Amino acid sequence: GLSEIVSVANTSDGRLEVFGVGSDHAVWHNWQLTPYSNSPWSGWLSLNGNVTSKPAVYVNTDDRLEVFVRGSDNALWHNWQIAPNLGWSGWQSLGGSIASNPAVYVNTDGRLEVFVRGSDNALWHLSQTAAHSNPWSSWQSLNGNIIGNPAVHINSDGRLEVFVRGSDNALWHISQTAPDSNLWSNWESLNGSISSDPAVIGTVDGRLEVFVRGSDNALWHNWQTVPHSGPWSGWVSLNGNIISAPTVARNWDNRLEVFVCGADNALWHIWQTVSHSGPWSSWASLNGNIISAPTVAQDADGLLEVFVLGSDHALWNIRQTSWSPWLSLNGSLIST
Amino acid sequence: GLSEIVSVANTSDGRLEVFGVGSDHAVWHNWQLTPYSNSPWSGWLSLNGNVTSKPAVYVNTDDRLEVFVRGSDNALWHNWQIAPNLGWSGWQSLGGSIASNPAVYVNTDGRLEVFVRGSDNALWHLSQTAAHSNPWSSWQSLNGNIIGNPAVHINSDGRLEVFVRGSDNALWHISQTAPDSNLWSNWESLNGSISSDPAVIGTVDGRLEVFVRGSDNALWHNWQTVPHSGPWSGWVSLNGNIISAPTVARNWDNRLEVFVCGADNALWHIWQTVSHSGPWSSWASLNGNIISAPTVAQDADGLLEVFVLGSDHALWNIRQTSWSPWLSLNGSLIST
Ligand SMILES: CO[C@@H]1O[C@@H](C)[C@@H](O)[C@@H](O)[C@@H]1O
Ligand SMILES: CO[C@@H]1O[C@@H](C)[C@@H](O)[C@@H](O)[C@@H]1O
Ligand SMILES: CO[C@@H]1O[C@@H](C)[C@@H](O)[C@@H](O)[C@@H]1O
Ligand SMILES: CO[C@@H]1O[C@@H](C)[C@@H](O)[C@@H](O)[C@@H]1O
Ligand SMILES: [Cl-]
Ligand SMILES: [Cl-]
Ligand SMILES: [Mg+2]
Ligand SMILES: [Mg+2]
């Protein structure tokens, strides 16, 4: 299945900032000039680098953005703001030999932690040694045999939990045994037969919920039946016909809403109705002609905004206001 | 002027939980049984103790609630959940000699920090030594000379910043010089002539904004004019005739909204219109007959919910749905 090709972050002064791989293999970025849904943008600025994955951005607990990418030497590289929303550090290597997009999250103690597929197809991770600070830990293996980019979320008890496509096409997960801990659970399978990266989110009632493209090209989901613990519900189809990984976000009223690339290469969405954890809507098309997975953020106004690579390789955007019309932010962007 | 008499926390499984002082001077709590605006409440459970302030509750970054109170001995006492949303430790003293409600915030490294007025009218503080865990640091003075209760917020660069009524009845502030620092700036005056505790919130564009009852009994506000920095706007009146401390929250679409006890002992509110930093609305009454400052929280549905001590000395609640009818949560509660 197709993968996400940008990340979006919310700056601490409330503006969205988008990171992509340019046609020159540099990381480029583009941001809203003002904190509002209909805001004009800066246009495209290079952060240089020579990269071969999607960039994954996270906001440090001191509000500096940090971007993680696979370099063309297959090491993990990072670049950070020197102060919130201000200038950038330049590229520093964190070593390793990686084969995926990095996935990033923040621990309860403010330390960033990065998960990758290694060249041995295990899940590997490493972390800041102190809140929002260098230096970083050594690389550590969590074993396994995976084929997806990993996805990571924090549980409602502070424990990170990672979801991957296994070599058997099942969904697998592994979690921290306590908040911030270097001791993880064994690998456990959630079964299923999947054909995308998984997407995970935390419901408002504190349960993780995971979304995948099944072998039948439908969207399927599975969720913790209690906060921060198994058992899981087991697999439920939301139907459709999709060709990307799904992406999921929480609306302002905490209904989940999922975005995919359809078989017709349009953007489609489906949502919980009425309230959080409510019964799901029909599938609805937002049109377009897209060649990536969609990426979704919530803006300062509380409205969802979606970013996609268009058939022309520009970055395009559409927002809750009916949704807005499609709007191009130009650029020449690539998939990895 | 009248103060807040409950504190409210958003638990990690999406339920509101209210703490108050009972007529027996113990701390009591009550919670939504499910994570919905529509939810029935548990009713009051005692946490015992013998207290002479409002309790202040905070959620540790590992999702365990923790409550801070002034004991009858004038010491700072705390009580914590042993697991998220599960059982309570019972009371432990952190010593000191305090004269105010405590105010608690979390640092960027996950360490709770508590701010009090000392017996010497100076601002004092102490902090967890590691993320979300005992032991605590020594008591330390940040000096100054203050009246009533402090208020604390985090800046959009992760620096804590505290606001107090000084003994000259101006608003004063003091901030960490760096995220998680123990080095604070000097005291600075923002002038004014106030007769309540201040309330502080962070706007969606990253600027702190403070609300106070002025000596004229109007609601006044002042804001950082840039993210995380002076100079401030200087004081502007939002008029009205109020007899409590104000409380403020952000709506789903990030319009700030302020709640007060009016001179007619009704609950009144006023909000930013159209968007975050659109012009303020007219004052509007939500009726009721109340004898405290209101306390506001956002529920899992993205809806504001307000708690007040009624004339019957029960706790009452009213919520965004046109607001709901008033609903009694019963109990027998007191101010200190
Ligand atoms: C630190 O170890 C190096 O990088 C890891 C991310 C793995 O790819 C491993 O095979 C390799 O030897
Ligand atoms: C449990 O069902 C299995 O896993 C799901 C994720 C889907 O791929 C379905 O077609 C497959 O048979
Ligand atoms: C505006 O610049 C265009 O888009 C960027 C994202 C890069 O692909 C660059 O090479 C290209 O010319
Ligand atoms: C606009 O109304 C004024 O302010 C409100 C907050 C109330 O105190 C009311 O009695 C007073 O007249
Ligand atoms: Cl299987
Ligand atoms: Cl003592
Ligand atoms: Mg299986
Ligand atoms: Mg003593």
CA of residue B70 to ligand 8 center, whole Å:
12
- Sheet containing B76-80: order of strands: B56-59, B65-70, B76-80, B92-93
- Cβ B13–A109 below 8 Å, yes or no? no
Identify the closest residue of chain A to B35 by CA–CA distance: A205
Chain A residues with CB under 8 Å of B204 CB are 14, 35, 300
Q: What is the CA radius of gyration of chain A?
A: 18
CA of residue A42 to ligand 1 center, whole Å:
38
Closest CA to B6 of B324, B321, B314: B314
Of B61, B108, B302, the CB nearest to A158: B61
Structure tokens given for A297: 């953020």
Q: Are A108 and A154 in contact (CB under 8 A)?
A: yes
Chain B residues with CB under 8 Å of A320 CB are none
B103: CB partners within 8 A, 6+ apart = B56, B114, B115, B116, B149, B150, B151, B152, B162
* Count of pairs with CB atoms under 8 A, one residue in A, one in B: 132
B314 part of a folded domain: no
Strand partners, A320: A323
Identify the closest residue of chain B to A156 by CA–CA distance: B12
Ligand 4 pocket, residue B262 CB under 6 Å: yes
Chain B residues with CB under 8 Å of A158 CB are 61-63, 84, 132
Chain B residues with CB under 8 Å of A36 CB are 275-276
Q: Are A285 and A262 in contact (CB under 8 A)?
A: yes
Which residue has the least CA distance to atom 7 on ligand 1? A118
- Cα separation values, B66 from A102, A307, B106, Å: 35, 40, 12
Q: Are B248 and B211 in contact (CB under 8 A)?
A: yes
Q: Angle at CA A147, nearest 5°, toward A142 and A152? A: 55
Which domain range does residue B147 map to? 96-189
What is the rounded CA–CA span in Å between residue A11 and residue A42? 14
Ligand 3 pocket, residue A42 CB under 6 Å: no
Chain A residues with CB under 8 Å of B303 CB are 253
User: What 3-state DSSP class applies to A24?
Assistant: coil
B227: CB partners within 8 A, 6+ apart = A12, A13, A84, A85, B155, B156, B157, B205, B206, B207
Task: Match 């941001």 to its residue by tokens.
Answer: A31
Mutate to test the interface with B, among A157, A175, A277 (most CBs of B within 10 A): A157
Which residue has the least CA distance to atom 8 on ligand 1? A118
Of B61, B254, B301, the CB nearest to A254: B301
What is the rounded CA–CA span in Å between residue A100 and residue A147? 9
B3 part of a folded domain: no
3-state helix, strand, coil in chain B (%, to 5): 0, 50, 50
- Sheet containing A295-298: order of strands: A295-298, A304-309, A315-319, A327-328
User: What 3-state DSSP class applies to B237?
Assistant: strand
Of ligand 3's atoms, which has the minimum distance to the CA of residue A22? 8
Q: Which residues of A touch B (CB under 8 A)?
A: 11-14, 35-36, 61-63, 83-85, 108-110, 130-132, 156-158, 179-180, 203-206, 227-228, 251-254, 275-276, 300-303
Identify the closest residue of chain B to A111 by CA–CA distance: B109
Residue ranges lining ligand 2, Cβ < 6 Å? A 192-194, 212, 214-216, 220, 235
Ligand 4 pocket, residue B264 CB under 6 Å: yes
Q: Are B294 and B281 in contact (CB under 8 A)?
A: no
CA of residue B74 to ligand 3 center, whole Å:
64
B265 part of a folded domain: no
Chain B residues with CB under 8 Å of A83 CB are 157
Q: Are A267 and A290 in contact (CB under 8 A)?
A: yes
Q: Are B246 and B199 in contact (CB under 8 A)?
A: yes
Of ligand 1's atoms, which has the minimum distance to the CA of residue A99? 8
Which residue has the least CA distance to atom 7 on ligand 2? A214
Q: Are B297 and B305 in contact (CB under 8 A)?
A: yes
The whole-angstrom distance between A312's CA and the closest CA on chain B is: 33
Pocket test for ligand 2, best of A197, A235, A238 (most atoms within 8 A of CB): A235
Identify the closest residue of chain A to B156 by CA–CA distance: A12
Ligand 1 pocket, residue A198 CB under 6 Å: no
B319 part of a folded domain: no
Structure tokens given for A19: 């990171």
- Cβ B13–A180 below 8 Å, yes or no? no
B52 part of a folded domain: no
Documented resolution in Å: 2.0
Pocket test for ligand 1, best of A101, A116, A139 (most atoms within 8 A of CB): A139
User: What 3-state DSSP class applies to B301?
Assistant: coil
What is the rounded CA–CA span in Å between residue A331 and residue A265? 20
B157 part of a folded domain: yes
H helix count then E strand count, chain B: 0, 31
A149: CB partners within 8 A, 6+ apart = A3, A54, A100, A101, A103, A117, A197
- Cβ A302–B275 below 8 Å, yes or no? no
Strand partners, B272: B280
B161 part of a folded domain: yes
B201 part of a folded domain: no
Which residue has the least CA distance to atom 3 on ligand 4? B240
Cis peptide before A135 (omega within 30 of 0): yes
- Cβ B13–A227 below 8 Å, yes or no? yes
Q: Are B203 and B209 in contact (CB under 8 A)?
A: yes
Domain total of chain B: 1
